Amino acid sequence: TMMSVLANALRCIASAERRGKRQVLIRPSSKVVVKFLQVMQKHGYIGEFEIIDDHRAGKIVVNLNGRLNKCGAICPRFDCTTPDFEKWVKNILPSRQFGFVVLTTSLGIMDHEEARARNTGGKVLGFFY
Amino acid sequence: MTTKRRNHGRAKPPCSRGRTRPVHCFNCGRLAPKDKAVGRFVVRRMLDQASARDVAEASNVYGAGFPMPKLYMKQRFCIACAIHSRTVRARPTDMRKRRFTTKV
C-alpha cells in the first residue's frame, strides 16, 4: 500500500514536470495535500488546481506552468527547530536563495521563512525548488 | 555472467514455466528441454528423380497413377548436433536477433 499520502502525490508532479506536461492527475486527496499546493500557487509555481468530488475520495487535478523543478517529501517528518532551520535549508536544497522547505506547526502549514518570523519550529513536511 | 541471449536460447519466456519436458535426439540420444531443442521438418523423398523415372515406367497404378508418398518426420536436434552438420551456423550480432518464426 501507500504509507505516505504526500509521496503518492508529489511523485506524479515531479515526473510530469520532467516530461514538461502541463497538467497532472492526483489519485487521492487530503486536507494536507491541499495546503501544500496552496503555498506554491501563491509564490507562483502553479496556475490553478481543481478538487473533484466522487463522494468517496476526491481526485485533485493541477495545472503546471512548468515553473517547478522538484517537489519532494520528507517522509519520517523529522523534528526541525529554530536553530535547525539552517541545517535542513543547506543540506536538502540547492540554495538558500530560492529553496523552500515547508513545515507543519500548531499554527498551520507554512514556509520556513514564515516559520522563523513567528518563531515556532515543528515537524517537516515537504520541500520544493 | 553476461546475458548473451535475452531468451537464453529458448522459446520459453521468463516467469511462466521454468520447466519444459526433455526430448531425445535422433543423432546422439542427448536430452535437452523441448524449447531449447532445434526443430526442423524434413519432407524426405522415397525416390531420387533419376530413379523416379525408371520406377514410374514399370508402374501403372502408381507414379503417374497416384503421386508418390514421402516420409515425413519432425527432427529435434541438440545444439552441438545441429552446428556440426552446419544446418545452424553462427551469425553476426544484427542477424542473431532475427527470427523467421515457425515458417521456412
Partner: protein
C-alpha cells in the same frame, strides 16, 4: 483544447467504471412485461439470478453472468439509470 479536469465525450465512452473520472455505475434497470398476463415488473440488467412473478412460469431473466438474457416474447421498456 483537451483538459483532464473536464474530459472529452469520446474518451469516456470507452473507459471502465473503475477507471472513470466519477466511478459511477455501469448498469440500468428495465421493465420486463410478463407475457403470460399483463404484469409490469422491474428487472435489473445484470440480474445474476432468475426472477419470477406469479403471472409467469415463462420466467423473466436467465441467471447468466454477463448480463441477463430476457425471455423471448416479453415487452422491454428501458428505464433510465438516474
Amino acid at each position: 483544447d483537451s483538459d483532464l479536469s473536464y474530459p472529452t465525450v469520446r474518451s469516456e465512452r470507452m473507459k471502465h467504471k473503475r477507471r472513470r473520472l466519477v466511478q459511477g455505475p455501469n448498469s440500468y434497470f428495465m421493465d420486463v412485461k410478463c407475457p403470460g398476463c399483463n404484469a409490469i415488473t422491474i428487472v435489473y440488467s445484470h440480474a445474476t439470478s432468475e426472477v419470477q412473478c406469479n403471472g409467469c412460469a415463462t420466467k423473466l431473466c436467465r441467471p447468466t453472468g454477463g448480463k441477463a438474457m430476457l425471455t423471448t416474447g416479453c415487452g422491454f421498456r428501458k428505464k433510465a439509470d438516474h
